[PDB]
Amino acid sequence: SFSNFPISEETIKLLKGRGVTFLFPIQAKTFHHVYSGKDLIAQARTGTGKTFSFAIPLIEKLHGELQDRKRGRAPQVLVLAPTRELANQVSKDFSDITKKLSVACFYGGTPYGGQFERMRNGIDILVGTPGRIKDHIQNGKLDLTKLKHVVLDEVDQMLDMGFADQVEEILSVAYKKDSEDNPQTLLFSATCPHWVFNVAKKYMKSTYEQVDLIGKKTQKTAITVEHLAIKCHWTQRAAVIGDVIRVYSGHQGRTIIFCETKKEAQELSQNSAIKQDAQSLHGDIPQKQREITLKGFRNGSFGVLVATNVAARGLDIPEVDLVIQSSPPKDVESYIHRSGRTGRAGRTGVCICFYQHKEEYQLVQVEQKAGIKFKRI
RNA sequence: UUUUUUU
Ligand SMILES: Nc1ncnc2c1ncn2[C@@H]1O[C@H](COP(=O)(O)OP(=O)(O)NP(=O)(O)O)[C@@H](O)[C@H]1O
Ligand SMILES: [Mg+2]
């Protein structure tokens, strides 16, 4: 039931088409904060439902306002994500649950024509990646001065170096120092350390809310994910991975293998231990192929995806029951987000980290920092 | 390193 929340009958019917019949904890704990207009920073584990944590109350709020739908109208909501496929996926959690609001998704490697047409038609909710959106602001086509709501998903990556400046210049169009006409700021991640909270305060009002479902003294990773580790020299790694997938991935199960470089990921996808069922996904793949590859992985045209961290965050593929990491990452955030491509929305999954003898120090650091212990198989 | 306008 939805009886504690102001969700219309029409949104309940659309949410049923997505398999949503009640709010998950992170959604229940944030709904009135978002709906009523307060700023919010929220931390919850991978796979617990952060996307609808902002999308449903924002849609209910916007449905309850005037909405005259004039042609060429400026966006009321901005959502930023760190990758093109994540933006596309987040886009659909708005679009699937409104018939009224015009939802647009702008990112790179896409033709401009369709994006200009949506701008001419009018946008209510804009989801996208920073680069292409910055581009449309600077060519004069996009108006973000009328934003009422700004979501940074994966906020800790959006505000790290590599995005901080791009994000800053985009938000500088809508945010001014010391102001009460600034849009509502909504910030979400499975990993929200002190530094992110500190940088976040610059964009938030004094009246902001915090919701932390992870807390201290709790494992950082999704609770339904089992963590295993395999010691293996890099010369053996491809073959053992091939055998691991055959026995640790289940009936109609999908596997993601994460590697540290585009070069490693591409070459592993070619290795005959896995190439027959595998495709690569990384930033040197042209965007049309990235989307075809991801869609095939989602619908089960092949069962093994070899990816860089382009696929580490946000992507939700329910059939992924096996994550393999080719080596322990030096950033524990990377291990946490990668491991969380499995074990989502209460399903169990397995994450297996390969490591060389000289990478054992990094394995131990991931263990300690994430609050987990690897079974060494 | 890896994302992320254009190339
Ligand atoms: N209330 C709900 N009822 C049923 N399914 C839900 C509900 N909320 C979310 N889901 C589904 O659960 C999955 C996880 O949601 P998602 O919003 O991707 O999690 P997340 O917290 O953003 N994970 P991440 O980005 O990896 O840190 C998706 O398949 C959702 O559609
Ligand atoms: Mg997410």
Numbering used by the authors: 187 to 563
From the article:
RNA helicase DDX21 plays vital roles in ribosomal RNA biogenesis, transcription, and the regulation of host innate immunity during virus infection. DDX21 is composed of three domains, including the N‐terminal domain, the middle D1 and D2 domain, and the C‐terminal foldase domain. In summary, here we reported multiple sets of crystal structures of RNA helicase DDX21 either in ligand‐free (DDX21‐apo) or in complex with AMP (DDX21‐AMP), ADP (DDX21‐ADP), or a nonhydrolyzable ATP analog (AMPPNP) and a 15‐nucleotide poly(U) ssRNA (DDX21‐AMPPNP‐U15), corresponding to different unwinding states (except for DDX21‐AMP). We elucidated the conformational rearrangements upon the ATP and ssRNA binding during the dsRNA unwinding cycle, and described an RNA unwinding machinery including one wedge helix, one sensor motif V, and the DEVD box.
To better understand the RNA recognition and unwinding mechanism of DDX21, we determined the crystal structure of human DDX21 helicase core (residue 188–563), encompassing the conserved RecA‐like helicase core domains D1 and D2 in complex with AMPPNP and a 15‐mer poly(U) ssRNA at 2.24 Å resolution, which represents a post‐unwound or pre‐hydrolysis state in the unwinding cycle. The DDX21‐AMPPNP‐ssRNA ternary complex structure contained two molecules in the asymmetric unit, named as A chain and B chain, respectively, which bound to a poly(U) mRNA mimic, a non‐hydrolyzable nucleotide AMPPNP, and one Mg2+ ion. The complex structure revealed a canonical DEAD box RNA helicase core closure process, which brought the N‐terminal ATPase and C‐terminal helicase in close vicinity to create the functional ATPase site and the nucleotide‐binding cleft. The two domains (D1 and D2) of DDX21 clasped ssRNA, enfolding it within an interaction network that was dominated by polar contacts. DDX21 formed eleven hydrogen bonds with the phosphate groups of the RNA backbone and recognized six 2’‐OH groups of RNA backbone, which thereby discriminated against DNA substrates. Uniquely, Gln352 recognized both the base moieties and 2’‐OH group of U4, which was not found in other DEAD‐box proteins. Thus the RNA was bent between U4 and U5, and the bent region was located near the DDX21 motif Ic within the conserved α6 helix, the so‐called “wedge” helix. The presumptive attacking water for ATP hydrolysis was close to the γ‐phosphorus atom of AMPPNP and interacted with the side chains of Glu340 (motif II) in the D1 domain, His523 (motif VI) and the amide group of Gly500 (motif Va) in D2 domain. More importantly, only in the AMPPNP‐bound form, the residues Asp339 and Glu340 within the DEVD box bound to the γ‐phosphorus atom through Mg2+ ion and water molecules, and incorporated with multiple inter‐domain interactions. The interactions, in turn, established more contacts with the presumptive attacking water and stabilized the interactions with γ‐phosphorus.
